[PDB]
Design a protein around this nucleic acid. Structure first.
Lengths: 57, 76
RNA sequence: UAUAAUGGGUCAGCGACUUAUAUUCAGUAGCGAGGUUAACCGUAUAGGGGAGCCGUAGAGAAAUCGAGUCUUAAUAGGGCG
RNA sequence: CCCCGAAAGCUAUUUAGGUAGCGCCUCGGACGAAUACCAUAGGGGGUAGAGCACUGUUUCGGCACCGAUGCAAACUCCGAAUACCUAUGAGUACUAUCCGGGAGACAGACUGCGGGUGCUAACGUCCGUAGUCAAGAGGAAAACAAUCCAGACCGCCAGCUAAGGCCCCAAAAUCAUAGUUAAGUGGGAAACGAUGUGGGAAGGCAUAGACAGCUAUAGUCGAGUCGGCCUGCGCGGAAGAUGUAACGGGGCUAAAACUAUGUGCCGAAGCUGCGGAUGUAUACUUUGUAUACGUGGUAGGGGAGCGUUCUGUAAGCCGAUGAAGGUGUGU
RNA sequence: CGGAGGAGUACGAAGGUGCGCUCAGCGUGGUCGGAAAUCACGCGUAGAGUAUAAAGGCAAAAGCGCGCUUAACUGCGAGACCCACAAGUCGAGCAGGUACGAAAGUAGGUCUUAGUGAUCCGGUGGUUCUGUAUGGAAGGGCCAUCGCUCAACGGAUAAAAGGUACUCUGGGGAUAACAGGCUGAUACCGCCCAAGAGUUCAUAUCGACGGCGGUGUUUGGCACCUCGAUGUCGGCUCAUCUC
RNA sequence: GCUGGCGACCAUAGCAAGAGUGAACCACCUGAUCCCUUCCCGAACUCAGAAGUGAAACCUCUUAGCGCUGAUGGUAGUGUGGGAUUACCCAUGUGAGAGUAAGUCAUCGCCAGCU
């Protein structure tokens, strides 16, 4: 139902839509962890920034 | 010296309203130099081959006829 | 720009967004469909002085009309209100 | 002192280092979900690639056609990924939009990707696109705006990490396992040349005796031998002017080099811990208390203050039991 | 100051409408008449044409004829495209008058995209506007229209070429000449393959056609440093390094 | 079950080759008085009709002969992140064109007339 997403790298130099995906997931800094619903809409944002997040199911 | 160096101003042609969008009578749908698209139901043709809506509805693109022409129409 | 680009040998003193008028916007105070006097008079920051100005109606080049008016053969349509 | 924060573009200009409108910044007001990210659904294309059906161009055959075979920014029978437009939807976010006050700017630079130009030259020049600098400190790269990691409110002799590293200069493994190199290769370079050394696949001949040498195919001799292919790491090709000067240095060879795998650790102004300040919002239905999110900054915009001279308050208050000024100390 | 071409027009029909028609090429035959004129029949075929450059188009052909005609109208115009402004573009539909069709209908120039010039100042035709005491008039306004190779084409004036080594000021390393820097086309040096030359014999010595590098001397490219100054071609004196 | 008219669809549907049909319909056909027609022509268009024919044409059937359709798998390209710079490699997502196997001698709607 819900998964935990942790930000592992900086977002300062990433693409605009990638920063917007992090913001739309709710992550704010390196090491921040959020708990979000497991829906395809959220998973799209997660998969777009797969390279700087870590997911715990 | 060179004998080249000229060009004309842009003309901004192209599709203005895509399939599935809602239009109001008079809205321009396609700007085109020739008849790349042809006018279907509820679509009119201007003197410079512009395609425009003559009724309120939803735009639809299709291919029909013996010549395989591209048509655009407005469904009410 | 460490730059081998400019300026300064050092100290003390002086040295550069002002003033008048008009106008627009914001804040604040008085009065409020009204607000306000100018020159001037005045044992004079008072009190007088309503000429004038701004607001309260617009349309049209204008004559003209006026919550309408212009365009037009049109009461249609349309533009400014 | 606090908050926000650009641009070096488009269009026009006796214009090109000026200026104006628009784009980009800031402040006030109005209005709230109308906005964005992502997921589904609908849509057009003529690029990358490819192809020869048109237009050109090309080679070899056969009798302009026919058959095999190539090429194209201004060719197309075809044709993506992305990007762009629209609708619906979850979650997250002070998002979009409109009306006004004030601007600055209109010399850009480098790097990656797609290109024109140039010699597939230039730290060259002109566009598109993204990042950084500009206007941005910290750590790595010897030193090094534009590369990598990362965005500095203040304090701490606390902890964890990123890039990058762990023999000494100099913080952390002279750590573990298995191989390769002998060139200080590592720590600059090509066509080409060569029994350098690892690994792999296949082939030829051979104890009715193979290769080399030896004796004039026979003959002693008693195991492997011969020639290519693929691939890892090395060698030569390799000449310059102040002084080793092409690992930063010392030094390094079962490495302190290279390849693969695994345990730890060091490492930033990043993250966490403790203390303090400040801005915005939400609630307390006064507050000055809690929670959440912020506080790098040039040109600029906005907000809040400290001191100096003079006027009133002031015929007041302080002053020869010592004012202003000067010079130390403490707070 | 990249690669290639066009425009500064034309047409009262080459516009509107109703009706009608398909090109080009080739092969056969047929007087002059053939490569190619015109006639007849067939085969596969848009390869023709579209006033003009190219592109996008063109069977209800947008290509080609005939008859009648003036919609190459007047007042407008929902709604859009494009856009700094000024401008530019498409447009269903309403009213009046009209043309061609039996009619449903079609027509607000031409298949489209170039064929162009703001404002000021004046000229001409209209006009129920204005008219400096009053009635007129002059002049002005409104509607339609005329005069620019203002081509440096958003057009500074109605009206304008040169010299300065006799020179001067404000600026720029935003921008040239010297030297430095980046680069190495060019320059110089080296190597690979080897037809051939050398009485025979590529390699004693040379070495065609081609290929790969090095250096930073030359001629150059760029414009990064210096224009609030880095101030010289050669000679003299004195040198120091590379191979 | 055949014939005609009007559509849907626009090659798996078309082209080519062979074959078949005259009861009705259709087509060829007879004539040029009147309507109407030829930049000349009753060829076309038009009118008045039934002596002939299914020849031509149109329709229907058969054939994979040309054409058209066309997988699976692989290759090229490509968004994001990383590594390299003749421009490729890795992770992940996506994925042609050509060619190969193979398929195709269409499929439907309304009206009217015959047997």
């Amino acid at each position: 139902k819900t998964i935990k997403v942790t930000q592992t790298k900086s977002s300062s130099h990433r693409l605009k839509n990638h920063k917007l995906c992090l913001q739309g997931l709710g992550l704010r800094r390196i090491g921040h962890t959020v708990e979000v619903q497991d829906t395809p809409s959220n998973r799209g944002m997660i998969n777009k920034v797969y390279y700087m997040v870590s997911v715990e199911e | 010296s060179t004998k080249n160096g000229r060009d004309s101003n842009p003309k901004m042609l192209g599709v203005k309203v895509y399939g599935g969008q809602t239009v109001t009578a008079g809205n321009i749908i396609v700007r085109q130099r020739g008849t790349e698209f042809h006018a279907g139901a509820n679509v009119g043709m201007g003197r410079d081959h512009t395609l425009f809506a003559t009724a309120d509805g939803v735009v639809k693109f299709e291919v029909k006829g013996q010549f395989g022409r591209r048509y655009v129409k407005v469904e009410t």
